[PDB]
Amino acid sequence: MATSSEEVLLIVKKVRQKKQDGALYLMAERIAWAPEGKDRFTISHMYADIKCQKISPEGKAKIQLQLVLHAGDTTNFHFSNESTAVKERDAVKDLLQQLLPKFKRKAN
């Protein structure tokens, strides 16, 4: 709050997760989740606040990612529709591995 406001990266009003289907919000340092609501999110896990990353949507069901909390909490998420399980979500995850470099440098 020293410049303006938080900076979010992307939001997906449509998301499916073995628990529920709900809209997924991605923030620079965290992943948020929400259900049929307004424009906020039911939850938000700070990428640094969470540590575990598995990328399983390259040739899988239809785009599902998995992250775990330094604690013992996992975060599984999926996107999919009659025909919306593709690029859309594709880029979503594409963001995931894009911020992954913020709280965890993978390569120099």
Short mmCIF file of C-alpha atoms in Angstrom, two decimals:
data_model
loop_
_atom_site.label_atom_id
_atom_site.label_comp_id
_atom_site.label_asym_id
_atom_site.label_seq_id
_atom_site.Cartn_x
_atom_site.Cartn_y
_atom_site.Cartn_z
CA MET A 1 0.00 0.00 0.00
CA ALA A 2 2.91 2.33 -0.64
CA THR A 3 2.27 2.84 -4.34
CA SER A 4 -1.37 2.12 -5.12
CA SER A 5 -3.11 -1.20 -4.58
CA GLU A 6 -2.37 -4.90 -4.85
CA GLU A 7 -1.43 -6.20 -8.27
CA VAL A 8 -3.33 -9.27 -9.43
CA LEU A 9 -2.39 -11.32 -12.46
CA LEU A 10 -5.48 -13.20 -13.69
CA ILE A 11 -8.88 -14.51 -12.66
CA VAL A 12 -10.93 -17.42 -13.95
CA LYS A 13 -14.63 -17.18 -13.17
CA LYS A 14 -14.81 -20.80 -14.13
CA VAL A 15 -12.91 -23.47 -12.26
CA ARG A 16 -13.50 -27.01 -11.21
CA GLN A 17 -11.83 -28.65 -8.31
CA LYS A 18 -12.57 -32.12 -6.99
CA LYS A 19 -14.21 -30.27 -4.14
CA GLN A 20 -16.38 -27.82 -6.05
CA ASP A 21 -16.60 -25.91 -9.24
CA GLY A 22 -15.83 -22.32 -8.52
CA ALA A 23 -14.03 -19.33 -9.92
CA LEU A 24 -10.31 -19.17 -9.46
CA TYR A 25 -8.45 -15.91 -8.95
CA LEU A 26 -4.69 -15.71 -9.34
CA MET A 27 -2.75 -12.96 -7.60
CA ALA A 28 0.89 -12.07 -8.06
CA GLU A 29 1.89 -13.81 -4.83
CA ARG A 30 -1.13 -16.04 -4.26
CA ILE A 31 -3.89 -18.14 -5.71
CA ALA A 32 -7.46 -17.22 -4.76
CA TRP A 33 -10.66 -19.15 -5.10
CA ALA A 34 -14.27 -18.13 -5.08
CA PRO A 35 -17.73 -19.48 -5.86
CA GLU A 36 -20.74 -17.81 -7.45
CA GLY A 37 -20.21 -14.48 -5.71
CA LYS A 38 -19.13 -11.00 -6.75
CA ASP A 39 -15.55 -10.22 -7.75
CA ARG A 40 -13.55 -11.36 -4.75
CA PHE A 41 -12.42 -14.79 -3.65
CA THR A 42 -13.34 -17.29 -0.99
CA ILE A 43 -9.65 -17.99 -0.31
CA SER A 44 -6.12 -17.06 -1.29
CA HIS A 45 -2.90 -19.00 -0.69
CA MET A 46 0.27 -16.98 -0.80
CA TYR A 47 2.65 -18.79 -3.09
CA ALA A 48 5.40 -18.29 -0.46
CA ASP A 49 2.78 -19.23 2.10
CA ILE A 50 2.61 -22.52 0.23
CA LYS A 51 5.39 -24.75 -1.07
CA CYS A 52 4.96 -27.68 -3.37
CA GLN A 53 4.41 -27.69 -7.07
CA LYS A 54 3.37 -30.40 -9.43
CA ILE A 55 2.58 -29.67 -13.05
CA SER A 56 0.32 -32.36 -14.41
CA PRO A 57 -1.62 -30.72 -17.25
CA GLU A 58 0.49 -31.19 -20.34
CA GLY A 59 -1.29 -34.24 -21.69
CA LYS A 60 -3.79 -34.92 -18.92
CA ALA A 61 -7.52 -35.05 -18.25
CA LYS A 62 -8.07 -31.39 -18.98
CA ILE A 63 -5.77 -28.98 -17.11
CA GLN A 64 -5.29 -29.65 -13.41
CA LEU A 65 -2.56 -28.16 -11.24
CA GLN A 66 -1.41 -29.00 -7.73
CA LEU A 67 0.39 -26.96 -5.09
CA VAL A 68 0.98 -27.66 -1.45
CA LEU A 69 1.27 -25.56 1.59
CA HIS A 70 4.50 -25.56 3.60
CA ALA A 71 1.98 -26.93 6.02
CA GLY A 72 0.06 -30.10 5.23
CA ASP A 73 -2.43 -28.62 2.87
CA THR A 74 -2.63 -29.20 -0.83
CA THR A 75 -4.31 -27.11 -3.45
CA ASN A 76 -5.67 -28.93 -6.47
CA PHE A 77 -7.48 -27.09 -9.19
CA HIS A 78 -9.04 -27.87 -12.53
CA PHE A 79 -10.64 -26.06 -15.40
CA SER A 80 -12.87 -27.83 -17.91
CA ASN A 81 -16.03 -27.50 -19.91
CA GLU A 82 -17.64 -28.99 -22.97
CA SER A 83 -14.93 -27.13 -24.82
CA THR A 84 -13.38 -24.65 -22.39
CA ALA A 85 -10.71 -26.94 -20.97
CA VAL A 86 -7.97 -25.57 -23.17
CA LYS A 87 -5.89 -22.43 -23.87
CA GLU A 88 -7.93 -20.42 -21.36
CA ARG A 89 -6.93 -22.51 -18.42
CA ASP A 90 -3.82 -23.41 -20.36
CA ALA A 91 -2.62 -19.85 -19.85
CA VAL A 92 -3.96 -19.94 -16.29
CA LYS A 93 -1.50 -22.63 -15.34
CA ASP A 94 0.86 -20.87 -17.72
CA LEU A 95 0.68 -18.12 -15.13
CA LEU A 96 1.24 -20.48 -12.23
CA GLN A 97 4.63 -21.56 -13.55
CA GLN A 98 5.10 -17.90 -14.37
CA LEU A 99 4.94 -16.68 -10.76
CA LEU A 100 6.55 -19.82 -9.45
CA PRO A 101 9.71 -17.92 -10.30
CA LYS A 102 8.80 -15.16 -7.83
CA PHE A 103 8.84 -17.06 -4.59
CA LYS A 104 11.00 -19.90 -5.86
CA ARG A 105 13.65 -19.34 -8.50
CA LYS A 106 13.93 -22.43 -10.66
CA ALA A 107 16.65 -21.46 -13.11
CA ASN A 108 19.24 -18.71 -12.97
#
